[PDB]
């Protein structure tokens, strides 16, 4: 398994711990602050929680699946 | 004197956050 970096300053990709596995990501904008979207803080865990955070850290049970570009043409 | 807090990260590159 792999997982996005912490993002200190270039979002590129790193393995998970012997515990967590799933990409988190914590946000306090979750919408569009300007410039740069959201804070979004990019990390490895172990659990992922849902229950209408209204900013909190959220999670997918994968690998690199909290990318945060993800900004593709066609 | 800048005394500059504990700038987080953003999406990318806004910089130092505050401000």
């Known amino acids: 398994i792999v997982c996005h970096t912490t993002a200190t300053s270039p979002i590129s990709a790193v393995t998970c711990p012997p515990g967590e596995n799933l990409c988190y990501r914590k946000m306090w904008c979750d919408a569009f602050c300007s410039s740069r979207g959201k804070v979004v803080e990019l990390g490895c865990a172990a659990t992922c929680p849902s229950k209408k955070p209204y900013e909190e850290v959220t999670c997918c049970s994968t690998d690199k699946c909290n990318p945060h570009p993800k900004q593709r043409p066609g | ?19």
């Open chain 2, 1 to 19: 004197i800048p005394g500059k807090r504990t700038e987080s990260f953003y999406e990318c590159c806004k910089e130092p956050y505050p401000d």
